[model samples]
Target: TRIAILGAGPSGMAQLRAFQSAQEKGAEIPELVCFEKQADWGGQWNYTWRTGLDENGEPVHSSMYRYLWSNGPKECLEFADYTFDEHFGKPIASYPPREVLWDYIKGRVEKAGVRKYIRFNTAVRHVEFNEDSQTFTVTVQDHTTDTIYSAAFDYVVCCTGHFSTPYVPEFEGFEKFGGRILHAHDFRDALEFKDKTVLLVGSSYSAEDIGSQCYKYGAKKLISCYRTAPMGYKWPENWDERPNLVRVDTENAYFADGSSEKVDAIILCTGYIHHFPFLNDDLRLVTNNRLWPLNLYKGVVWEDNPKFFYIGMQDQWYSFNMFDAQAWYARDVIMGRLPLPSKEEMKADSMAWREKELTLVTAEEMYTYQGDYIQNLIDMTDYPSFDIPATNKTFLEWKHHKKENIMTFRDHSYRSLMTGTMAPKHHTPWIDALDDSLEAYLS
Candidate 1:
């Protein structure tokens, strides 16, 4: 009769919305109790300056930073039910700042009137299943009341997300480095790196976006070292790519090719671990970020315990939209509208997806695979299905736009698949749009 949603982030919010939508259609929904460690919602989209821990002393959940904009086009991740045109009452740019995206996310659930289901500043401590009762016991600490308690639920949906904990690797001479050494998770204001030569480790989106932010805000020079291949983007004059980072001295970082550059700071964009300390080891997800993770039947149901589920845990070529599809599917299962197959069948189905996932190579294939996965989920539920090919086309265009001009890609706008309306160009060019405030964007 009761469901426990751990974390009131986008995925958890989506679960709430899915139930609410069902209720609106005259279906009796179960009692939804959401536990959010953060004082506010939005999960990783909720930016904070404090690193390591929050006021509650829990490890910080958000890895977002200041001056960050959506690296991907908004159209690709737009909600099927809530169109960008519907939310803004007008077509906006395809790429928005972090605040704008956060506002968009809040608008949907706010309208759904599901905020009452959430218990803010409450961290879920542990989850255990009772074989006799076939129910789950959730232990949580409520920071606001300074109380710890436990509750039971018929089902548990783990939406705590996978981007929180940093994967900090030890590098040579890191202890004796002269300048600051921080993971991208700790990085905030870009102005901190302005007019200073910065060395970034890792060649993924974090390095590309953060390095671009440092460059945009007037960093003197930028050097990004890659373990695999470089980003291979046409970077600015001061920005250069090097091979592996061999070591660091007091003043300079030495690369694999025996090249060195004097730097003021080193940003480790090495990525995040799929950490869920609150979950028991048997219930925890322990795979690296990828398109397909084993033990998840249809990417949401935990095979060992079909009552256990997870949302928004994918590597995420699709973000908000994928979460919506997953949440809706999970909702149906909890409602008994969708029947689960046997455990062996679930494991076999999951393995088939993983096998197909291993053969993917090109960028087109990757997004297509994820789109197909989302389509499969949406088909099984009442979630509104949008044009996946259109979204994938936008992704292709976004990739090309970035390759064409990494600095100016955000300046271009794409048509929304949700509404089929062409988005208006932003009021200011992304490069000159120094103010990331929502007010500045709306103006």
Candidate 2:
């Protein structure tokens, strides 16, 4: 059997590591190859200063900016097989900077000897599955050769994340809006807004985090408008959370509340859309970003086509560990250790989960729902068992801390679910930690 995994980021890395785990136990695995678009691993984790296009005319994958730290507890996303202590040689902070967390992700997979499977500087151009042959034909654009090639595989796992594509909605007078308008996907620096009034649209993670970052770095004023509800946090005097933004002129923005404010730049912190352009419509999993996308039988396997699968493609509350759990389960299906149920059974199960998904009312319930999903995947695979309850508790603490103070939540520490040791607090407050280098974080 041969498997071709797409994109060597967290999801694809987890899949490769899963097979490596099984191979280490003397299980004979199939031929594995992973295609990555970047010159290196760590998909979104690779923070590039260049935004619009790389030297090769490829879209940059980095949405990360300088001074960006983990908004959630690192303990919640730590891999079960690779504990923070094992990777860092000690327990660090609960909330880590981007570099620190990226290093930890690389550390775990580095020891797996799976790097050889990944083809860096390569992109999947197209994918088509054959019903009769039970195979997939994938076209590749390899930058190294500067040529196109194709290959056939028994299974193709799409690991390209949803965050790369920017979903920029049109607003009135946006074309004529004097200042620059950019999406959060390309937002790479807050230093540019140090002395300017910035307008951010959205109530999600990007809006909240970037707004706090601008405030910390001396932005003259931060005006964030949300469509549904205000973030409702006790922010600094310079920062104001307004109702949804309706329109913007050259130098001013009007809100849904009939109020107006002058702004230097407008940023759309609006979330991303799920895009798999490489795969044709039939093989694509078309759904909005959600925990329970309808087509996936177990959130990993495609119900319409079981041979095609996806990992780390959900709108996530659980991050790395959830991917690990998913990869392990996916590995079993490919290895024939776990037989997939009938397609009808799979669709029934998926829809049933979505029915429960509709009733989720609170943040705690959302995480709990995700935990239950992960727990189901864990039960059927040999992936290292993790304490989901403990992780959920950590999430609860993180939510409370954020609600108490968004600016200082990163300063709070939590016990590691992977190692059972409490992590040390960061040496500097999140506001004062201007230098986000790995050395500064470890020190």
Candidate 3:
């Protein structure tokens, strides 16, 4: 069987590693090919230091930038067979720059020998499945040569990330703004805004990072606005008092409590929408202004079509490491080691997950996501078996520790369980426990 994985990003790489591990265990491995649009290995990291194009039409800038770091800590963000430097001397420290991460990912791809299998500069234009033959025909475009090619595969995995397209909300009169307006993706440095007032839109991690950095770069004032209250994460206690960080609730522009000061240079860090223009509309998979699909069962393959799988589509508060978990699960489905959920079951599960996510945060808010890591790990047949330690206390006790040391315990726990370092345990039913514990917080 042949498997065509689209986008050689972290999720695609994870699928590659999972299949390799299966091969090592005497399992039959499918023929695999990875397609990446970019000439480089790193997906998002490639855009980190990008500056205006040069005369020769090459990106011009040093690899390192003043403000480039993972919102999640190194441990939570690192991928399989890789570890970030631990001697940085900061608790839950951010990376020095984006290059550090890009280098790490590139090294992983090389060491795993997956680099040889990737077709760089090749982007998948469309994929269609033939029900009779049960095969997928993928049409791809080669950017360098401007030529199109077609291939047939037994299965297809879509790892194209959700952030490929920017989400720009239509304001009443954005064109009337007079000053410069840019999305966070295009923002590089704030040096050009020295002594200028900046109005940063959205309150996600990107806005927080950019607003703070612009202030340090001598922006006269940095005002951050959002439609809803921002979700704060676990950070070193000292950062709570950082000046130049302003949070506002626009409340659909009414500003019920009255308005805050405004300024120049609107940097919209308002998040992103999903782009799956290649998929047929009959898929019926997208919602919330087409930002993300509504009915991915546990954010995996489509229920009716096991041959089609998705990766890196779901948003989460924790980190992107969840991609590894999803990829491992996907391998099980691809290899027929696990059964696909029924269409009805898929719809029900998706609805429940969506409702839970809305309770946690609004769909418009960044980092609002569905799918619980522990429960998902359990559902995925490829994951390690669950075991209740004889020496351990009740599941409630373990749950307590899980919450208290979320950064340390949950992050490593998922990795350890996924990689076979440890066994999982049947904690009290997760949904019940979560309801009991987080109900008040959710309210």
Candidate 4:
């Protein structure tokens, strides 16, 4: 059997590991071919200084910025099969910098010997499913040869995440804003705004992180606006969270309550869209970035086209482990061990979950809903199911710490459910940790 996996990020890496795990148990895996647009693996974790496009003129895939640490605790994302103790030789801090986390993701795939299966510097251009052949003809442009080619595969796993294509919104006077205006996607360095006042839009994870990061790295003041409610965290003295942005003139922005602030630069942290231009309309998924995207049975199998699959496509509450769970499930169904349910059965289960997902109000309730969804997928496969409730509890604690002080949540640590080891706090305070190097973190 021949299979194709798209985008060698965390999700794609998890899928490869699942097959490797299965092969270790004496199962014959297929001839796997994974295409990665970037020159190296680690997808988004592999940070780049350049924005917009790379040398090959392909849209750059990474949205990682400098001095970025894991906003959430690492224990919640630890792989059940590969513990931090096994990878790092000891327990690291609960919140690691991007470089440290990227290294951890690389360690498992390197150990699995799956590097040989991935085609680096290859971008998937198009994928068309042929009903008669029961196969997908994947078209790709290989940068190595500056060539375009096509291959037929028995199955295709769409591991491309939702964060790559940024969702930049337009305001009434955005074009007239005299100062610099950029989205969070293009924000590469916080040092650029060291002595200037920055205005950020939206109230999601990107807004919270970037706003705090700018404040940490010496932004004169952070003026943020939420479309609905404020982040409501106890922010630093220089930071101010305002209501929705009404409009911007040349040097200032007016809020919904007729208030204005002098802003030197603007950063739109308005989150990202689930973009997949390569797939045909029949295979494309169209939904707001949510916990339950319609038409995916078990969030892995495409109900309209079961042969096509998805991994790590959620408004992610459980990041790495949840991807591992879904990847293992996909591998089982691909290997012909787990038969998919009827279309009616698949739709019924997915709809039930979606309806329940709407009623969740609190952040605690939202994460628990996703945890229950992950538990259901892990139960069907050999993926090691760690304590989901324990992870959710860690999330609750994380929220509380943020509420107490958004500037110091990483200082708090949590115990690992995967390894039963307590996480150590970072040596430097996150606010004062100017050097985010892996060496500085370990030091």
Question: What pairs collide in candidate 2?
Answer: 178-250
Model 4 TM-score is 0.99
Question: Which segments of candidate 4 are over 4 A away from where they belong?
Answer: none
| True-vs-predicted CA distance for residue 45, candidate 4, Å | 0.9
| Best-fitting candidate, scored by lDDT | 1
Superposed Cα deviation of residue 398, candidate 3 (Å): 20
Over 1-443, each residue of candidate 2 has an lDDT whose tens digit, in order, gives: 89999998889889999999999999999999999989888878888898878867877777888888888999899898988888888778888889998898998789898999999999889999888898999999999989999999999888999888888898998977888788988787788988999999999999999898888888999999998888878888898888998887878999988999889998899988888879888888788878788888789898878888899888889999999999999999999999998888888888899999998999999999999999999999898788999889989999999889888988999988877898887788788999999998897
Better of 3 and 4 by lDDT: 4
lDDT score, candidate 3, position 324: 67
Local distance difference test values of all predictions, in order: 0.92, 0.89, 0.58, 0.90
Model 4 clash pairs are: none
**Candidate 1 pairs with clashing backbones:** none
lDDT of 4 by residue, 1-443 (tens): 89999989999999999999999999899999999999888878899998888989988888999988888989889999999899988778899999999999999999999999999999999999998999999999999999999999999999989998989898889889999988898999898999999999999889989988888888899988899788888778888888998888989899997898899998989989989989889999988998889999888899999999999888887899999989998999999989988999999998998899889898999999889988998888888878988999999999899888878888989999988889887777788989988888876
- Tens-place lDDT per residue, model 3, 7-99, is 877777777877876777789989998887777666676644454442233322222234454434343344434443322112222222355
Predicted structure 1: lDDT: 0.92
Q: Provide the TM-score for each candidate, comma-separated.
A: 0.99, 0.99, 0.72, 0.99
**True-structure lDDT of candidate 3:** 0.58
